[PDB]
């Protein structure tokens, strides 16, 4: 009945359009945070996607998300949606197809956000993540780092930024932290993550428009890689317990897939919303 | 002696109040009308004017453009103060009456309420200084600074009731919104006409050709000899305020003319120009003994010739007064481009400066001092793109880039302007931006001082297709992507001082080494020459500026990188933007 | 990929240093074909056979084909000079000795994935930098 | 009996404060919606009333009701019977319930050494310049729309004259330092982003392709928070919670801190503003309203001022609350904070009497000067 953390875990490519005026080759760019330039989803897009999924359940939509745009009478929604910040991203590797890349700065920002928002299971996650971050800083000692926690993953190569994965044996990764951040997790410096998540390294796809075999238009598209993880905060205010429980159970159902992003018909931005499990 | 200086009008706010081209024109001409009516008694009483040269020609209607500025310095005999006060009150009472209930779409109006609103809104401040010298060079800046400080006193209406229609209090936007009047019908087989307000009948005259402006498409697309406004008016009046309906109908009518429709017909260009350091020019004409009346003559002649050129090209003059110009013109019509119009305007300004300021031109020639010049800001946008955003973009271009006010503003906010840094202020620039319907935005800046501008204009003239008539020069679109992709290599080539031209020619020959490219040697040579000229001008203008900016310790790294411009990359971007504009004009989705 | 300006600069300096371009910005015509064929040979055959074929002196060719291998070695040396020396990095920054044939270096310095990537990038840089000059 | 609190608002996300919504009226909306840097005092008062009605669980939920007239009476004596309107701008009492006095909203900087707070005010429009108003008489007289005024001779306090090409006081905010006045740019305080929004076209219905808009969202710098002072009468508890302030469901966090008793919040605000005092002029600290600007202009030689727009959402104690709210039929213009009034010789008390004649606005947080 308070602020809750949700994880997105996109199962496909995701393209949430900024609508910004492009200065380069990529016509369609993805939404990025103003301050940190990390990929993000606007709260309006999150609310739109979740309302689209639940649109059939009219009472739940009216109670939680509010009235329709054409409704003759307006009811404010009881649920407040926040921005979805990038948690982890898949990066190309050599021993494995990919690794889930996280940075120290995004971990610190997540800790600050949970402290500021006071999530449901905030305390244990804050304590364990703070201990992990302090151990990481103790082992790094001001140097650029890339730490794997699976012993088999030692010596892994991040392809885009040519760095090698080290294994600190005295830094334990708790199972809940693995469930939150992902499997085959790599913790590296935020400079490496910023380079990996910048415009020159995010996947760019060429697209065509053909009329009777003649190309009408050409443009390039930017997408967020599949299996990337994003987190947002949901504030319910104080909604009906039955509608809120229905919303949480439907969201956490393994068979529930939410479409966030532009290209729905060609399978862009299908995700599985998770809840912060108790530690 | 007994000089009088008059400043009037919250021009920026009223221009902000317009969301359409016709509303912008009405707002701009409202203040010209006010100034004309305010100053016509003093001109009729034949007193010497030290600022604006008010002759018979400026009082005549000139294609619906406002030639009357907002600042007037005026020599007054005793008895002009209360005369000016009473005339200001009377010219508020009139106009308040003129907006009461002519053939204007509305319900009813209270003359006293309109007069109160106009008095609370329209700024009318005048200063009667007692100076000791009759020299214009002394009286003009001394009164100008006091006018500048006078402009900071704010007067506004306290209450604005706008609801239940018939008790309105915002009448200026009623005037600008309803300036074409109410479209009136009197027959089943005739041409519907606009019952224009007092502004239209004072601006556009009353002698035929009375197609008053309505929606931007008619000048956005005026080369097809299609009376789009007549068809739009007949379509609107065939069924059943009206600005949106006319805009939609005009768009549809332009859509059924796909046969001879080119993509630039839906794009509109905004032109803004200001005088490059007119105050320092006046100081120079104070040092060398040249009267300022010659400068006023040159400015008035340039204004008249610029109005004529804008009308001949096919655009619309919004405001041309003093050193300031605002024009709405088609991107390309009847074979001429926007940049052709800009070149013509620059040529007209130079011709008027030479004709009316020959003594000062000769003095500054051997003295090695800069001459008066025009900085230009051009914005081309989709017709549906917000006009406020387009005007803000044009202002940003002109002021910040073309007048180099980014450098000066960043330096002054940190209080490091000094004088050696002031030596690096660059004028005589052309800022141009084209934003597509998808927001691709091509922007560049160029210096009109050297031959790079001439070569740019010649390239545009050469490689832009003319309408079907005998052959053109066969522009090649593959060079656009080559320059973008090979930009760093071109920078490396440009940085080689001894073998720059040979390396550029060799690179273009070796990349475009196929049989088809034998017909594009002229294009390759032209772009090579333009690139070399632009790089030379850029290094001359910006090298020492970049070194001193980097050597500065106060400025932050981000502000340093914003202020620092790379000469080679800037030249490459200019070539890229020129080629993109050529391709945009040339290509049509058949 | 995208064109690397620093590698183009290294290619220019190595082409000048290995006596490919004369005092005038001109080179013998066959070197264009040499540079273009080197990458295709590297892909189709192995890296070692291609380096052996192009590094081979006393061959019957219209010009000095081993000069391109010299240019490649110089570019690789410049790249390794510019490499960042940090822990948890993959690249080895030791320069290739001037008394060493490239074939011998690749022979006794195996696991040559980094060397393969460097050689391909240097070949691309050589191809793109040779276009600034004219063929006699 | 009269407890005074200090309320600090921390922006938990991007916030949006509504503007005029239009440069005209009728049915038109604004494609570009811009965000005011500050909320109206009406927004603060309504937030206080809503939070009080949340603490004492008396809320207007689901369609419409009449609210049990005994509950109507208790809600009247709690929050008043009426919203903020400028019709009662000369009333000697706020007319609300337990709410008595609200200070103008302050920009407070919180440092790492969280023991002291820095209060930031807009830079006075005359800062760094000297204005003289030479009175040798018969020299030169300004006529501001036909009223006599002495000529405003102005010089930088460092001669030359006012160069409006270098005038930039309107871009700066200021705070007290143990030396000179610290100038902070508005850019360094507020971060602004423009968001594009559409309604997804659900077919088999709607003519709504027309749903397309841009909005401006403002974010405060990490060390900056909003704050104001409130006086609550008798038995009235204000608990820290999560509140709504501004459009688009902008969310904030209250910290309710009870300062020592027998304190005057007006005196606290004026003590904060003391460092900007100049004896030859009046500095407008909060949006000031005068019914007629003519008398004010007659009372001073120069009005280096600007104007802001005001329009309140007017709701009765028992209103619909689910529908288009009724807004003040009249759009009102206030004097922008940081404006300076250079009065004539003497007559400072006359201008002060004119300004404090509207005690209702003074209690709310408007018409405050130093
Ligand atoms: N008709 C005119 N005759 C003489 N001077 C004029 C005339 N119109 C305007 N001026 C001069 O224009 C000056 C104001 O110019 P403005 O502020 O537009 O910019 P500028 O000095 O031309 O250049 P910039 O914008 O680069 O600073 C005044 O000092 C005034 O003397
Ligand atoms: C930005 S305003 C500043 C002062 C303002 N003109 C006033 O009197 O309050 C100055 C600019 O307004 C423009 N301008 C002046 N008179 C105008 C008019 N009648 N119509 C349109 N623009 C005008 C010119 O570009 C001039 O340089
Ligand atoms: Mn000007």
What does this structure look like?
The structure is cut from a larger assembly and holds chains A (about 280 residues), B (about 600 residues), C (about 140 residues) and D (about 375 residues). Chain A has about 280 residues and is an alpha+beta fold. Chain A has helices at about 45-55, 60-65, 105-115, 120-140, 175-180, 190-195, 240-250, and strands at about 5, 25-30, 40, 80, 85-90, 100-105, 145-150, 155-160, 165, 185-190, 205-210, 215-220, 230-235, 260, 270, 275. In chain A, strands 1, 3, 4, 5, 6, 7, 10, 13 and 16 form a nine-stranded mixed sheet that branches. In chain A, a hairpin with a 5-residue loop joins strand 5 and strand 6. Chain A is globular and about 60 Å long. Chain A starts with a strand and ends with a strand. In chain B, about 50% of the residues lie in helices and about 10% in strands. A six-stranded mixed sheet of chain B has the order 8-9-7-12-13-14, sandwiched between helices. A three-stranded antiparallel sheet of chain B has the order 2-1-3, covered by helices on one side. Chain B has a two-stranded antiparallel sheet with strand order 5-6. In chain B, a hairpin with a 2-residue loop joins strand 10 and strand 11 (about 335). In chain B, helix 13 (about 290-315) packs antiparallel against helix 14 and helix 18 (about 450-465) runs parallel beside helix 24 (about 565-585). The longest helix of chain B is centred in the last third of the chain and has 31 residues, at about 520-550. Chain C is mainly alpha-helical and about 140 residues long. Chain C has helices at about 5-15, 30-45, 45-55, 65-80, 100-110, 115-130, and strands spanning about 25, 135. Chain C has a two-stranded parallel sheet. The longest helix of chain C has 17 residues, at about 65-80. Chain D is α+β, with helices and mostly antiparallel strands. Chain D is built from seven helices and 23 strands. The longest helix of chain D has 15 residues, at about 40-55. Chain D is globular. Chain D starts with a strand and ends in a 6-residue tail after the last helix. The interface of B and D includes residues 119, 125, 157 and 159 of B. Strand 3 (about 125-130) of chain B pairs antiparallel with strand 7 (about 140-145) of chain D. Bound molecules: adenosine-5'-triphosphate, S-adenosylmethionine and manganese (II) ion. S-adenosylmethionine binds near residues 9, 11, 12, 70 and 151 of chain B. Adenosine-5'-triphosphate (ATP) binds near residues 278, 282, 295, 299 and 322 of chain B. Chain D: It holds the Pfam family Cas_Cmr3.
